[PDB]
Amino acid sequence: TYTVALTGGIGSGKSTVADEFAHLGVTVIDADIIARQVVEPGTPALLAIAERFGPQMINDDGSLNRRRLRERIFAHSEDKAWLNALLHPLIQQETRRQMQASTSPYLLWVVPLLLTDKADRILVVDVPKETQIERTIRRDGVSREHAEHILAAQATREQRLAAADDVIENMGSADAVASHVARLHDKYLMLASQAAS
Numbered sequence: 001t002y003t004v005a006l007t008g009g010i011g012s013g014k015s016t017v018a019d020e021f022a023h024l025g026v027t028v029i030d031a032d033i034i035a036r037q038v039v040e041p042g043t044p045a046l047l048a049i050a051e052r053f054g055p056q057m058i059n060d061d062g063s064l065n066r067r068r069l070r071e072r073i074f075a076h077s078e079d080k081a082w083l084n085a086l087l088h089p090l091i092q093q094e095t096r097r098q099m100q101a102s103t104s105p106y107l108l109w110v111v112p113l114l115l116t117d118k119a120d121r122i123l124v125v126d127v128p129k130e131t132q133i134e135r136t137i138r139r140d141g142v143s144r145e146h147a148e149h150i151l152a153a154q155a156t157r158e159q160r161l162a163a164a165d166d167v168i169e170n171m172g173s174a175d176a177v178a179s180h181v182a183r184l185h186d187k188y189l190m191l192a193s194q195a196a197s
């Protein structure tokens with residue numbers, strides 16, 4: 001099934017762009033969003049996390065208290081391995097369930113890392129480094145110090161652009177951005193049909 005890899009540095013707007021493709025009928029696969037769904041209120045994985053570390057891991061609205069989980073993980077690196085063993089298999093299953101359950105002409109695979117050989121096409125969401133730094137501050141509420149260092153750990157802008165088949169500058173007017181997404185959608189639709197034959 002035709003697959004487009006969506007990638008881009010932190011704060012470039014991957015989620016907003018993927019959400020626009022989603023409103024066009026495209027199946028989006030994002031393990032970051034699936035990981036938060038397998039521990040949503042009432043799920044077995046959240047119960048297990050609470051059974052293990054205590055009810056304080058569940059906040060007033062029945063959702064995971066990620067502050068206390070971070071602290072626990074930070075104080076006991078052994079719990080990260082158990083958390084992985086718990087969640088990783090649930091993310092794999094829910095990833096395949098969404099693939100197998102897709103009737104869309106093509107599939108959008110959100111992948112922050114770059115896994116460039118697994119997809120039929122690579123779409124890079126790009127913005128200037130400064131824009132990356134600010135949009136991180138207001139989206140996550142973190143500090144810039146932490147933002148610069150998160151950005152240092154990732155691939156460089158030139159690296160992403162060099163591996164891209166298509167690029168979308170998530171800057172300027174949203175309408176223009178959404179229009180560019182629609183044009184790419186039409187392109188990918190055609191590449192999917194071509195591939196089918």
Ligand SMILES: Nc1ncnc2c1ncn2[C@@H]1O[C@H](COP(=O)(O)OP(=O)(O)O)[C@@H](O)[C@H]1O
Nearest residue numbers: 009010011012013014015016135139170171172
């Ligand atoms: N064209 C734009 N102008 C202003 N803010 C934007 C634009 N596009 C995206 N954003 C904002 O940037 C923030 C981070 O984007 P996000 O989708 O989280 O990127 P990523 O998923 O790559 O981290 C979001 O809060 C979003 O509202």
